């Protein structure tokens, strides 16, 4: 006679049964049943200063939209790194070892914002 | 009787008939006399003489055996020196 089709949540079951609704944990439970919040585990919203901002939620109809071109890795490379290498190649001051000079990162370890695996949320 | 066998879908011969009766192509069937090898010491000489003979079958018995045997056992067999050569045909019978 139990309803099998309804979702299993903490409102149901005895007192002992509990579970989260998806809220991210922000602290630790120490011995003796004491909660110790950790400030670093609490997200902090980085909010910019909007003074002098010239952009509003809606855009004018008169303004014409452009052609959609999903950005690709090749396109970014040509814009940023290709010109430096091209000029350097003419000057001859280019070597395989110093690709980092143009911005190459050998490993993501040591970066605050690791590209992969991502260590930063949206 | 197996009227339709699984592997081939054909009628199956009963081998109890093949080992007891002989069919002549005309349609007659031959058989032995039951007990011709049994307790011969107490049978009369005339009694034993009858048993040794080969006997024919009736229309019903012949009809039965024809249902329990397949056409292969109803064909013409050209055996050289066959001791039943002359008996496969009926002659001077009006009926």
């Amino acid at each position: 006679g139990a309803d099998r089709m309804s979702k299993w949540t903490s409102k149901r079951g005895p007192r002992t049964f509990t579970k989260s609704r998806g809220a991210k944990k922000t602290g630790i439970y120490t011995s003796d049943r004491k909660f110790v919040q950790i400030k670093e585990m609490v997200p902090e919203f980085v909010v910019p200063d909007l003074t002098g901002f010239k952009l509003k939620p809606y855009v004018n109809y008169r303004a014409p939209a452009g052609i959609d071109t999903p950005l690709t890795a090749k396109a970014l490379f040509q814009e940023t790194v290709a010109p430096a290498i091209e000029k350097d190649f003419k000057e001859g001051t280019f070597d395989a070892n110093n690709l980092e000079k143009y911005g190459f990162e050998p490993t993501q370890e040591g970066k605050l914002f690791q590209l992969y695996p991502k260590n930063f949320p949206r | 009787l197996t009227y339709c066998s699984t592997r081939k879908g054909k009628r199956k011969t009963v081998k109890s008939v093949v080992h007891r009766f002989l069919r002549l192509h005309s349609g007659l069937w031959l058989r032995r006399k039951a007990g011709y090898k049994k307790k011969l010491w107490k049978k009369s000489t005339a009694r034993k003489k009858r048993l040794r003979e080969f006997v024919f079958c009736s229309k019903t018995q012949s009809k039965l055996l024809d249902k329990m045997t397949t056409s292969f056992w109803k064909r013409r067999n050209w055996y050289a020196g066959d001791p039943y050569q002359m008996y496969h045909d009926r002659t001077n019978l009006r009926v």
């Binding site: 099998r4 149901r12 079951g13 | -």
Partner: protein
């Protein structure tokens, strides 16, 4: 006496007996799940 009230609901009893973890414990229970997935059932277990 008066029958008909055999079902004495307890969520701890229910989930232990016919729950997901209980079913997966044995291959005979996992084959219960496997058939239910084949049929198309809304709920595979409790």
């Amino acid at each position: 006496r008066a029958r008909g009230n055999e079902y004495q609901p307890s969520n701890i009893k229910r989930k232990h007996k016919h729950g997901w973890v209980r079913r997966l414990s044995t291959p005979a229970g996992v084959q219960v799940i496997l058939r239910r997935m084949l049929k198309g059932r809304k709920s595979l277990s409790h």
